[PDB]
Amino acid sequence: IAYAMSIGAESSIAYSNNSIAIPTNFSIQVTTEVLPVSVSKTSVDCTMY
Amino acid sequence: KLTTIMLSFDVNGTIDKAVDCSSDPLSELKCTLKSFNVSKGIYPTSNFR
Ligand SMILES: *[C@@H]1O[C@H](CO)[C@@H](O[C@@H]2O[C@H](CO)[C@@H](O)[C@H](O)[C@H]2NC(C)=O)[C@H](O)[C@H]1NC(C)=O
Ligand SMILES: *[C@@H]1O[C@H](CO)[C@@H](O)[C@H](O)[C@H]1NC(C)=O
């Protein structure tokens, strides 16, 4: 199948010039980030190659 | 006998010192690293023995 990229769901916020919205409840979530540190230490030789 | 050796020379064309890297691991290190003074550490070596 072929389509166009959905950049995201189009949202709208009512900026009403005197109103705020305040959170009344919260949540705690754990996010996982993976970062490489090193690669394999490859040593080549003059003889035998 | 046929042997690989390393020979140094001075400004006068005289031979300073020899290695003969078929006898000692330090000699093989000296022939591998192309030097007569070797810094402290670990070095892979060639197959001159
Ligand atoms: C705020 O939200 C949390 C979860 O986001 C609510 O905690 C849950 O409450 C229900 C009802 O008692 C329990 O069955 C669940 O076990 C609770 N935990 C989770 C992880 O869902 C909490 O009740 C909310 N508080 C208010 C005031 O809305
Ligand atoms: C080379 O020979 C001269 C003598 O003319 C001497 O003074 C000098 O020290 C010699 N150089 C080396 C490296 O032996």
Q: Beta-carbon neighbour count of residue B25 at 10 Å? A: 10
Nearest C-alpha to atom 10 of ligand 2 is from which residue? B12
Distance CA B21, CA B30 (A): 8
Q: Is the CB of B10 under 6 A from ligand 2?
A: yes
Distance CA A10, CA B42 (A): 61
Residue whose tokens read 């030789």 = A45
Distance from Cα A23 to the centre of ligand 1, integer Å: 14
**Nearest Cα residue to B23 out of B9, B7, B4:** B4
CA-to-CA separations, A43 to A4, A39, A47, in angstroms, rounded: 47, 12, 12
Are B30 and B19 spatial neighbours (Cβ–Cβ below 8 Å)?
A: yes
Are B37 and B30 spatial neighbours (Cβ–Cβ below 8 Å)?
A: no
